Subunit: 29 residues, 3 copies
């Protein structure tokens, strides 16, 4: 259960980064 949560947090961190970069693109057109 704990390790599963950690893997989910890892996934979210990646999505985290993905959205940050996309918003940076959209900000600039």
């Amino acid at each position: 259960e704990w390790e599963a949560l950690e893997k989910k947090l890892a996934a979210l961190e990646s999505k985290x980064q993905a959205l940050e970069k996309k918003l940076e693109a959209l900000e600039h057109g």
Copy 2:
């Protein structure tokens, strides 16, 4: 403590989804 962590992760996953949906609407809509 465990519950609090799980619920925070679940809330983040939902926010994950809501924000991506809004980004898509802004980009394409």
Copy 3:
């Protein structure tokens, strides 16, 4: 281990709110 995971979640929450505000900015021009 636990303490590190809680720090990571708090960092994600903060990024959560930052990107939500950024998206709101973009929606309004």
